[PDB]
C-alpha cells in the first residue's frame, strides 16, 4: 500500500484536509490507507470513508451518464457513424468506476464488515455494500447482472433487518439506508411500488418517533425525512 508508511492518525488528518480542499480522490486514498491499518473505524472515520468514495464515484457516475447518453444517440436511426471512440471512452470511464466500486467492496470484505458488531457500524457498512453493488448494477449489461443486483439486494436486506431490530425509526443511518434501498427498488429492481411503500412507511414511522428527540437529533432526522418526501413527490 502506498500509504503503508504513513501513521493512521496522519492519514485521518490528511483526509480531513483533502475534504476541505475538495480533493476527494486524495481523501479516498487516505481513508483506504487508514482502513488498511486494520483497526476498526470510529463513527467520524466511517463517515470520512463514505464521503470520500461517494464523491469520487458520484463524479464517475455523472460522467458515465453523459457518455452513455451520447452513445445512445449515436445508435439512433439517421445518426452519422462516428467510429468506436464514444464506446471506447464510455468503456474507459466505466472500467474506472467499476474499479472504484471493487476497491470499496474489497475494504468492506477485508475486513470492515466482519469486525463490525455494533448496529451503527454494521448497518453503515452493509448499506455501503448495497450502494456500491447498486453502482455496479447501473452499468452492468452481462451474464452477471442479475447476480450483481442480488448482491445489492442482499446487503441492503441484512442492513434493514438489523436496523429494524436495533435502531429507532429516526436513526439517520436507518433512514438513509431506507432511502437508498427504496431507490434501489425503483431504479434497479424495476419495483416502483416497493420503492414507494418503503419510502412512505419509513417516513411515517420516523414522524411518529420525532417527539423523543432533542433539537439537534430532530434536525438530523428531518433532513433525511425530507429526502424521502422528495422522492415520493417525484414518483407519485
Amino acid at each position: 500500500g502506498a500509504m503503508g508508511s504513513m501513521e493512521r492518525a496522519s492519514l485521518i488528518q490528511k483526509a480531513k484536509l483533502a475534504e476541505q480542499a475538495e480533493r476527494y480522490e486524495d481523501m479516498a486514498a487516505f481513508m483506504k490507507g487508514a482502513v488498511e491499518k486494520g483497526e476498526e473505524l470510529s463513527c467520524e472515520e466511517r463517515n470520512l470513508l463514505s464521503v470520500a468514495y461517494k464523491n469520487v464515484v458520484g463524479g464517475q457516475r455523472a460522467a458515465w451518464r453523459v457518455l452513455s447518453s451520447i452513445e445512445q444517440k449515436s445508435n439512433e436511426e439517421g445518426s452519422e457513424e462516428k467510429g468506436p471512440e464514444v464506446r471506447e471512452y464510455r468503456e474507459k470511464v466505466e472500467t474506472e468506476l467499476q474499479g472504484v466500486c471493487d476497491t470499496v467492496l474489497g475494504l468492506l470484505d477485508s475486513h470492515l464488515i466482519k469486525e463490525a458488531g455494533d448496529a451503527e457500524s454494521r448497518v453503515f457498512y452493509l448499506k455501503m455494500k448495497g450502494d456500491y453493488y447498486r453502482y455496479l448494477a447501473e452499468v452492468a449489461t452481462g451474464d452477471d447482472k442479475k447476480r450483481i443486483i442480488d448482491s445489492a439486494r442482499s446487503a441492503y436486506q441484512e442492513a434493514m433487518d438489523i436496523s429494524k431490530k436495533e435502531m429507532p425509526p429516526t436513526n439517520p443511518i436507518r433512514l438513509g439506508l431506507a432511502l437508498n434501498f427504496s431507490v434501489f427498488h425503483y431504479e434497479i429492481a424495476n419495483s416502483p411500488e416497493e420503492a414507494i411503500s418503503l419510502a412512505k412507511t419509513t417516513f411515517d414511522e420516523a414522524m411518529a418517533d420525532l417527539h423523543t428527540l432533542s433539537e439537534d437529533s430532530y434536525k438530523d432526522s428531518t433532513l433525511i425525512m425530507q429526502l424521502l418526501r422528495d422522492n415520493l413527490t417525484l414518483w407519485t
Partner: peptide, 5 residues
Amino acid sequence: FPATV
C-alpha cells in the same frame, strides 16, 4: 435522478 445519501 432521485435522492440518495
